[PDB]
Every structure is written in structure tokens, then in C-alpha cells.
Design a binder for this molecule. Structure first.
Ligand code: GTP
Ligand code: MG
Ligand code: MG
Ligand code: ZN
Lengths: 337, 102, 112, 71, 135, 136, 55
RNA sequence: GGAGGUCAACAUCAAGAACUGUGGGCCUUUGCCUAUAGAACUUAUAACGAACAUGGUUCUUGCCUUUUACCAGAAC
RNA sequence: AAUUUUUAAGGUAUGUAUUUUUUUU
């Protein structure tokens, strides 16, 4: 078996370029909880906030377009539809509100969560919504009639995150009981349970192509192949915890933001960490306020947007020089257990 | 619409209580503080290790040192006595008086 | 009967979400074995620290793990920002003459 | 001590019905039924003659506030 | 691999068909002739001996429909399927103090820096300038 | 400033650009509607069919003595536009802009008053003609 | 603006008394109720707000 | 077979001034061009109704101890 | 050159027991 681990030095994974800080956008009165980008045109992005607003930022120039009020408590998660001109926002005030983009007003409230709802996922093909929160369940809403059609009972604790996939398991959910469940919605029961995490799973991201899912915990970032549900890879991590956010670029780049401010880029295929950064917090902030609460890659995949606990948005750009002049990353040491 | 004010009352009985009643309450708590919460037992109760072990309460309410046979008006007085030079001696005398026999 | 968040029961909900949000982080930092009494105790440090923020008292503590202190300071800066921003918003609302009710005035002037 | 809030499933397993008891709320009445798809003596005489900080309270906008409304 | 086009067009259809069954049934349940505008022998008895035809009689529109329906609580037993494997100094560092508040004691459980040269220099000038003026 | 300092643009954003009414996702409309400015027929299949056979009219265009250009003038509400409205309906076999009401009698059809202002203003603003053949 | 604010103020206090009982009916509250001096048992409030305001 | 029914079901009724069907031509049937057949009901001081109510959400207001009940304008 | 009318609720608690024909040794 280790004869293979002798050959496991033959891969030498996939060089990638280093990431650097292009621009910093202030302008939010609270923390920036969540970020979503225009799925079609990469023209602008939306930003949840502690201060209850949402602001639409112009992506090219970083200027501000319009602000969207309408929640009385923080806005935890945000989704913008590929197929619709709709913005779905969700808050800690137990409410899930649609936003018709053409007129920029509220359209449809979705009612019937018990307590705060921290996540929204739009099903790709079905005109459904998936939301979940401290209530420990997922509700699948008919987007047109605002009916909580299907309620997926499951995790024994608050659900942190929710994803949607077109084929089987259509709903991936990750709660604080350290279980990532893969749901069968038509039968309303769990297809497969992934227990390998030690503690609460605070972030999950879907790969734009490969059809797999990444999960995160304190020290551990795993991956999982959907369908079967098998473990695929692991990601090498020294104690980086807490992992708040994962995002996957088209290029097999995997970003993991921390609560220590340390940004950690990986290589999705290998599980190698090819860089680490630390944000420079802000002028008058505290060392406690240096962290990363969200993230995304735009559709091109060359620019990363992460809102941070210092009330700032930072757009992280990939270096054009790069290659192997001096890129070389943390340089591939496969330590053993 | 007198709800504008913001005061109110519960519907039970007749509130304030009588100045004499406050003193009884206040002189129990003061003797709880200075006593550091210990229950000093009555003299007749047939002995919860005591903090010390000599102080008691007679059939009346007064406090007494059973070594020194002194009578005390309050806890404050007792702490004067326990920190006194007479209550020092009677411990030494009982010290010797025990060290001469078993 | 899931009851919506309204004007009267707003800041109670703000409390509840804050307390949960702090237990999440601090429990995800610590190594493993024992939480619940420890879970209860950590929150008392939080509220105490907020009281200290309102009174401008610094809130140092004897031996406390630094990361926990980082967490508590972070959330208290969030809560302080929201508290101040509402203090200003209600104040301009009162100035221009719009109806601010009653105890929002009496509450405001304490904040200011 | 809120501790463990309330799980949905116990409220989702109740035998009322799929819907609630059948109470008809005022906000569940059908609305936006259709979706939308995307595609010089005087001068002389005198004696004295001739950055954004991150915080709410120490900021520049704040001092202006207490410079006015606290008078 | 990616799910593929022919498979995603399948589960899209079979789910979309299923959901409509839930939406239709749910709209037509509650009290609205208004909202319900959006909407088999079935039995071979036992050994099949008799056969069966089932027909649901029309209820009187005044009387409560679902006469047996009444809102009641139910505690649910646990699901059949079982046993999913879990497959997973500092105690003195992470030992928390005990919280003691100055502002509450419920139930039981009983500056450095010096001045500036600014002040030093200013008072001399006022002390000197005064002595000069008092002379 | 310097904490990033060199290659980085730190920009503080208050107020707004893009006034709040703008769609932020613009309504996508393929068809080009002229119905606000004028009431017009933009599709060839819908042009009213002419009994008199247009291509025979195009033959008359060559002979200079054959055609005469005649404008109609007069004071207010003398019937000029409603006069023209006689010649056209007699010329064309079916017109899509005829309601059963204007066909019957009650409301005059006004073919020449195409503009929406002229319809509302109850008046003729800009001159509009037609080219049609008619026998003496 | 001072005159406008007078007209608002005086009506707001009279409304204070009216809402104090339970009516906005004009018929119940003829101006003698607000304007008779306290020596005859009214409020004796002193009205500067009737006027006519130059527009 | 006709005249009817305070009978029923089903289909349809706010859109490039705005409908369908057909034959041919380019594309290789969507779509474009061309010839042709048939277009009931509703529309230009714009509409199934020569009539006219209520509710919901979000804004701006008015009464102002708070919710219901409310003031009166807008958008959807 | 013209306003506009009123009903509920936040105040007098709340809780427990009480009219019963003698279940076979
Ligand atoms: N009683 C009567 N009224 C008519 C007759 N002919 C036209 N009218 C009315 O008089 C008005 C004149 O119709 P138009 O053709 O629009 O008037 P016009 O000649 O176009 O006036 P312009 O604005 O100058 O173009 C219309 O409102 C008609 O309803 C008529 O013979 N008898
Ligand atoms: Mg009370
Ligand atoms: Mg109340
Ligand atoms: Zn003694």
C-alpha cells in the first residue's frame, strides 16, 4: 500500500498563481455577512450586512449603485437567480424576502420559519428555494405560490448552510452537529450522511464543474464526491480554525477564509495549500476585527470578493506575472500519520 | 388613557409595611453579614462543624462565649472578644489543661 | 404559531441571536470535552463586558485565554456599533418632528 | 439561558394537517401569481494681530453629532 | 463527471411533477374556492377474491370537511433505520475564570502615565510673567 | 491608506450613484412598441389589403399626366380628416383599426390622425396624407 | 411659521382633552368648555390661534 | 326539424394596432421572405362593466400612550 | 376657495376541591 505512497510523490500537483489585494471598498456600517454576484453579466455584487441593509456595488469601478432596505435585523444570506430577475434575501428576523430587480422592491415574503434563517439556496432548474436556520430543518418553497411544499427533517442542530444540485441529492446541508447530509427530496429522506467532521460544519461550497462538494470545520477542510457520497480528497491544514467560508474557482482554486484573518488558498484536485495571506485589518480597528465572514469568485474566476468583519469589502486579484520566476508555493510535503 | 404615565400596581394587598418591620429585617441581615452567614447554635440544642466552636446563644437571645463566660450584645462585640486578649488566655489555659491529661 | 419580529420584541431577539452567535465561535475554538457549565459562564463574561462598555470602564480580566477575549471584544464592537447607530437614527427622527412614540425618546436620551 | 431553541420537526410532525388547521391568513392570499423569466492705526493696536478611522464613536461624523444635539 | 444533460432533464421532470402534486393538494385543502383555481378501483381485495371499486361520496358544503380533522400534538417515535458510524497544558490555558459582576450578585455565590512638558512649561511662563508684573 | 498603500485603491463610498428607480436588471423587450407616440402598423402582413390592386397603381406612376397631387385645406373641424376617411374605407377592403363602433356610425374613424397627441388633443397637428387611385 | 405652529399647538392640546375623555365630536365640546376662565370652571386656556393667517 | 331556457360543461376575452390556417421559396422544423383563405366577441376623449367595491406588501403622510379600527396620496 | 364625529384591549387576578348509592374475598 505504501508502495503507492512511494508513487504518490509522482503527482506533483498543478501549479497555480499567487493572489494579491487589488482594492478595498469601505461603506458598510456593520459587518459584511454575505456576498452574491450577478450570475450572468458579472456587472455588480450584492452585500448582506449587520446593519440590516444591502448595497449593490458596481464591480468594475467599485462605486456604489443603490442601497436596499427592508430587513429589521441582520441579513445573513443572499442569492441572485440565474434564470430570474429576482434577489432572495434572508435575515435573522425569521423572514425570507424576494426582491424583484426590475423595480427594486419587495415582492414575496415566505413565511413559516420558527427562528432565524441563515441560509438560502436556489434550486437550479425547478423554481424552488431552499432555506434553513436554527430551526434544524430545511424548507423547500414553491417560488410562485410561496408554499412550504417539502420539509426535510434531519439534523439535530442548527443548519449552517444549504446547497442545491440538479440531479440526486438535490439538497446538501451542513449543520452544527458535524454532519453533512445528502437529501432525497421526492422521498423526503436522507440519501447519505457524511459524519467525518469533528465539530460543527460552518462552510460548504460546490465545485462549478466536477460535481462534488467541499466542506469545512475547525482544522479540517474535506471534499466529497456527490452521487455515491465518498470522501474523495483531504486538504492539508495546520490549525487554521475557524473556517468561515469556502469558495471554489473554475480553475480548481479553493479559497478558505478564516476567523484569524488568514486567507488560505488551496488546489482543489490535490488538497495542497499553495499560499497563505493575512489581511491588513484597518486604520482604527481591533485585532479581533480582522477576519473573513464570506467570499465569492466572480464568473470569470480571476477576482475574489470577501467581506470582512472590519466593515470592508476587499477584492483580491490574481497576479499576472506569476509563472515560476518566483511563484513557488508552500512546496508539497506529504507528511504522514 | 392614563396608561401614558407608566407606573402601576399589582392587585394584591396593602403595600408598604410598617417601619418597625423594616428594622427587624435590617438587623437580621446585618447580623448575617458580620456573622459571615454562620449558624451560631442555641445552647440547649444538643450538638456541621462551627467556624470556631465556642460561641452560642443562651435560652434568651444573647450570644455567649462558653470558655470565657462572657455575654455579648451583637456579632460586632463578639469579634472584639474573639480578637481579645482574654479569649486568648482561656484558650491557652485550656491548652495546658488538656496537655496535662488525656 | 411562529410569531414575527416586531417593534416590541425586537431587541430581545437581538440578544438571543448574539448569545447564540458567541457560543458558536467560542465552542468551535476550544479543544473538546466539557462545555455546558463553561458554556453558561462564558456568556456571563460577555454581558459583564457589555456593561463595562456602556460605562466606559475598560474591562480587563485576570487570567483569561486571549482568543476568547478577542471574540468577546469583536462582538461587543458589533453591538456597540448597532447601539450607536440606532441612537443617532432615532435622534434625527425625533428632531425633524416625526413620531418617535414615547419610551423611544426616554430610552434615546439615555443613549445620548 | 435559551440553550436549545425549538426544533421544527416536532412542529412539522403535528397532526393538524399538511397545512395548518385551515386558518386562512391575509398574507397567503394569492399574490404575484406569475413568475418572470430572464432572457492703519486700528489694525496695529491689538496684541495677537496677524483619513477614515474605523469606529463609530471616535469617527469624524460622530463628534459633529454630539457637537450639535448635545448643544 | 458532471451529472450530464439527459439525466438532469429527467430528475427535473420527475420532481417537478411530484411537487405539483403537493402544491395542488395543499391549495385545494384549505377553505378557498378562490385559491383552488390554481390546481381507479385501486384495490384487489386480499387474495383478489371479491375485487373492489372505491368511490368517494360528495360531502355537504356546509358541514365541516375533514370532520375527523382536529389540531392536536403528536410525539413521534424514532425512525427505523439505525447505526450510522461516526467515523471521526491547554486545560490550564483554556481554563476560564469565573464571572464576577460588579453590577449583579444574584442568588448565592458571594492608570499609569505621567504629565507632559506642556504643563511644566506653561505654568513657569505664568509664574515668571506674574513675578515680573508684580515687581 | 498605507496599510495597503501602493497598488491598492481604498475608496470610501457613501451616497449613491444610479438613482434608486433604475432597474438594475433592465426589462428585456424584443418587440419595438410605437404605441406611446403613434398608433401605427409595423408588419407587412397586416397592411390592409387593397381591392384596387396596388401593382396596377404602380403602373400609373410613370405617366406624368395620370397622377395629381391634391392637398385638402380649410378651417377647424370642417371635416377634412373625416372627409379623407371616406376615400380610404371605400378604397380598402378590410381595416384592422375599425372597431365595430366606428364601422357602424357613432364614432368617426380618423385614419389620417395617426399621432397619439392628435387623438387625445382631438385635433390635427402634423399633416398626413395617403396615395390611392380612384376612378372618375 | 410661528403662527402655523400656534395653530397646530392649540388644537393639539384641545385634542389632548378630547382624547382624554373619548370623542372628537364638535357637538360635545363647545368652545366654552376650553375658553371659560377657571373661576367659572373651565380650562381657561388662552387662545391666540383663531385669527386669520395671511397666505 | 324550428323557437326558446334568470339550464349546464368546455374553449376564449388588454396585444409590434396587437389573429390564425394554408401553398411556395431560403435555412435544414424553430426562424426569414412571398402568394393566398378565413377573422365571432372587446377597444381611440382607448375597452370585457356607458357600472364601481374591498384586501395585501412597500413608500410618503395625518391623528399620536401602544395594537386593532383608522386619515390620503403613490407604485406593485 | 370649508373641517368631521368610533369601537375593543393593556385593571381589578389565577389556581384547587366541592351535588356522586356503599364492585363479589
Ligand atoms: N353634425 C356633424 N358633425 C360632423 C360632420 N362631419 C364631421 N363632423 C364632426 O366635426 C368634427 C370634424 O371632424 P374632423 O375631420 O376631425 O375635423 P378636421 O377637418 O380634421 O379638423 P382639423 O383639426 O382642422 O383637421 C368631428 O369631431 C366630427 O365628429 C357632419 O357632417 N355633421
Ligand atoms: Mg400592570
Ligand atoms: Mg404590552
Ligand atoms: Zn471567650
Amino acid at each position: 500500500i505504501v508502495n503507492r505512497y512511494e508513487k504518490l510523490l509522482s503527482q506533483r500537483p498543478e501549479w497555480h498563481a499567487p493572489w494579491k489585494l487589488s482594492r478595498v471598498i469601505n461603506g458598510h456600517l456593520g459587518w459584511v455577512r454575505c456576498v452574491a454576484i450577478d450570475p450572468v453579466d458579472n456587472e455588480w455584487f450584492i452585500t448582506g450586512s449587520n446593519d440590516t441593509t444591502m448595497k449593490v456595488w458596481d464591480l468594475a469601478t467599485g462605486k456604489l449603485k443603490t442601497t436596499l432596505a427592508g430587513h429589521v435585523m441582520t441579513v445573513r444570506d443572499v442569492a441572485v437567480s440565474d434564470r430570474h430577475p429576482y434577489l432572495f434575501s434572508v435575515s435573522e428576523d425569521k423572514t425570507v424576502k424576494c426582491w424583484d430587480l426590475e423595480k427594486n422592491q419587495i415582492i414575496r415574503d415566505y413565511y413559516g420559519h420558527l427562528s432565524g434563517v441563515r441560509t438560502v439556496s436556489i434550486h437550479p432548474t425547478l423554481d424552488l428555494i431552499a432555506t434553513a436556520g436554527r430551526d434544524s430543518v430545511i424548507k423547500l418553497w414553491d417560488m410562485r405560490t410561496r408554499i412550504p411544499v417539502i420539509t426535510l427533517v434531519g439534523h439535530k442542530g442548527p443548519i449552517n448552510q444549504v446547497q442545491c444540485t440538479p440531479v440526486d441529492p438535490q439538497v446538501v446541508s451542513s449543520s452544527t452537529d458535524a454532519t453533512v447530509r445528502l437529501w432525497d427530496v421526492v422521498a423526503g429522506k436522507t440519501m447519505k450522511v457524511l459524519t467525518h467532521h469533528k465539530r460543527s460544519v460552518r462552510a460548504t461550497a460546490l465545485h462549478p464543474k466536477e460535481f462534488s462538494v467541499a466542506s469545512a470545520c475547525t482544522d479540517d477542510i474535506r471534499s466529497w464526491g456527490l452521487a455515491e457520497g465518498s470522501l474523495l480528497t483531504n486538504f492539508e491544514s495546520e490549525k487554521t480554525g475557524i473556517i468561515n467560508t469556502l469558495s471554489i474557482n473554475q480553475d480548481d482554486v479553493l479559497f478558505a477564509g478564516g476567523d484569524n484573518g488568514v486567507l488560505s488558498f488551496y488546489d482543489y484536485k490535490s488538497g495542497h495549500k499553495y499560499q497563505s495571506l493575512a489581511t491588513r485589518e484597518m486604520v482604527g480597528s481591533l485585532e479581533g476585527e480582522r477576519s473573513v465572514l464570506c467570499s465569492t469568485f466572480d464568473k470569470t474566476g480571476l477576482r475574489l470578493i470577501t467581506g470582512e468583519a472590519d466593515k470592508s469589502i476587499k477584492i483580491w486579484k490574481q497576479d499576472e506575472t506569476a509563472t515560476k520566476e518566483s511563484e513557488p508555493g508552500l512546496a508539497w510535503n506529504p507528511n504522514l500519520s | 388613557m392614563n396608561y401614558l404615565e407608566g407606573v402601576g400596581s399589582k392587585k394584591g394587598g396593602g403595600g408598604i409595611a410598617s417601619e418597625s418591620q423594616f428594622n427587624l429585617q435590617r438587623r437580621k441581615e446585618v447580623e448575617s453579614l458580620l456573622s459571615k452567614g454562620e449558624n451560631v447554635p442555641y445552647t440547649f440544642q444538643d450538638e456541621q462543624v462551627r467556624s470556631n466552636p465556642y460561641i452560642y446563644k443562651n435560652h434568651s437571645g444573647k450570644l455567649v462565649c462558653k470558655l470565657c463566660n462572657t455575654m455579648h450584645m451583637s456579632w460586632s462585640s463578639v469579634e472584639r472578644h474573639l480578637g481579645g486578649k482574654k479569649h486568648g488566655l482561656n484558650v491557652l489555659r485550656r491548652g495546658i489543661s488538656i496537655e496535662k491529661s488525656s | 404559531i411562529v410569531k414575527t419580529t416586531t417593534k416590541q420584541r425586537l431587541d430581545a431577539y437581538y440578544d438571543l441571536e448574539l448569545r447564540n452567535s458567541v457560543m458558536d465561535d467560542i465552542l468551535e475554538m476550544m479543544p473538546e470535552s466539557i462545555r455546558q457549565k463553561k458554556a453558561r459562564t462564558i456568556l456571563q463574561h460577555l454581558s459583564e463586558a457589555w456593561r463595562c462598555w456602556k460605562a466606559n470602564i475598560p474591562w480587563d480580566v485576570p487570567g483569561m485565554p486571549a482568543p476568547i477575549k478577542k471574540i468577546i471584544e469583536r462582538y461587543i464592537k458589533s453591538k456597540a456599533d448597532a447601539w450607536v447607530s440606532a441612537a443617532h437614527y432615532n435622534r434625527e427622527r425625533i428632531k425633524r418632528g416625526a413620531h418617535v412614540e414615547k419610551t423611544m425618546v426616554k430610552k434615546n436620551l439615555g443613549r445620548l | 439561558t435559551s440553550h436549545r431553541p425549538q426544533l421544527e420537526a416536532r412542529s412539522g410532525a403535528k397532526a393538524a394537517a399538511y397545512t395548518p388547521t385551515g386558518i386562512e391568513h391575509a398574507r397567503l392570499l394569492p399574490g404575484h401569481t406569475t413568475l418572470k423569466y430572464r432572457k492703519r492705526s486700528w489694525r496695529k493696536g491689538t496684541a495677537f494681530g496677524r483619513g477614515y478611522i474605523n469606529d463609530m464613536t471616535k469617527s469624524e461624523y460622530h463628534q459633529e453629532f454630539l457637537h450639535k444635539h448635545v448643544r | 463527471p458532471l451529472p450530464t444533460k439527459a439525466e438532469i432533464q429527467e430528475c427535473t421532470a420527475r420532481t417537478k411533477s411530484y411537487i405539483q402534486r403537493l402544491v395542488n393538494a395543499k391549495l385545494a385543502n384549505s377553505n378557498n374556492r378562490a385559491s383552488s383555481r390554481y390546481v381507479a378501483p385501486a384495490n384487489l381485495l386480499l387474495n383478489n377474491s371479491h375485487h373492489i371499486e372505491v368511490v368517494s361520496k360528495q360531502m355537504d358544503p356546509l358541514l365541516p370537511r375533514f370532520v375527523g380533522k382536529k389540531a392536536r400534538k403528536v410525539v413521534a417515535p424514532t425512525e427505523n433505520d439505525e447505526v450510522v458510524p461516526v467515523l471521526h497544558a491547554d486545560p490550564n490555558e483554556w481554563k476560564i475564570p469565573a464571572a464576577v459582576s460588579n453590577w449583579k450578585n444574584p442568588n448565592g455565590y458571594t492608570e499609569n502615565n505621567t504629565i507632559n512638558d506642556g504643563f511644566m512649561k506653561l505654568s513657569e511662563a505664568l509664574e515668571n510673567a506674574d513675578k515680573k508684573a508684580r515687581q | 491608506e498605507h496599510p495597503y498603500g501602493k497598488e491598492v485603491e481604498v475608496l470610501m463610498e457613501t451616497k449613491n450613484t444610479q438613482s434608486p428607480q433604475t432597474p438594475l436588471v433592465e426589462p428585456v423587450t424584443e418587440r419595438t412598441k410605437l404605441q406611446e407616440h403613434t398608433i401605427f402598423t409595423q408588419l407587412k402582413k397586416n397592411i390592409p389589403k387593397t381591392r384596387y390592386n396596388r401593382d396596377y397603381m404602380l403602373s400609373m406612376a410613370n405617366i406624368p399626366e395620370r397622377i395629381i397631387n391634391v392637398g385638402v385645406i380649410g378651417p377647424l373641424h370642417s371635416g377634412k380628416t373625416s372627409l379623407m376617411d371616406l376615400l380610404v374605407i371605400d378604397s380598402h377592403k378590410r381595416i384592422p383599426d375599425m372597431s365595430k363602433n366606428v364601422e357602424l356610425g357613432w364614432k368617426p374613424l380618423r385614419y389620417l390622425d395617426n399621432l397619439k397627441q392628435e387623438i387625445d388633443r382631438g385635433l390635427s397637428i402634423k399633416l398626413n396624407g395617403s396615395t390611392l387611385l380612384c376612378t372618375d | 411659521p410661528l403662527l402655523d405652529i400656534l395653530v397646530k399647538g392649540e388644537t393639539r392640546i384641545q385634542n389632548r382633552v378630547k382624547l382624554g375623555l373619548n370623542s372628537k365630536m364638535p357637538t360635545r365640546f363647545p368652545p366654552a368648555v376650553f375658553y371659560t376662565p377657571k373661576e367659572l370652571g373651565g380650562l381657561g386656556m388662552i387662545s391666540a390661534s383663531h385669527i386669520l393667517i395671511p397666505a
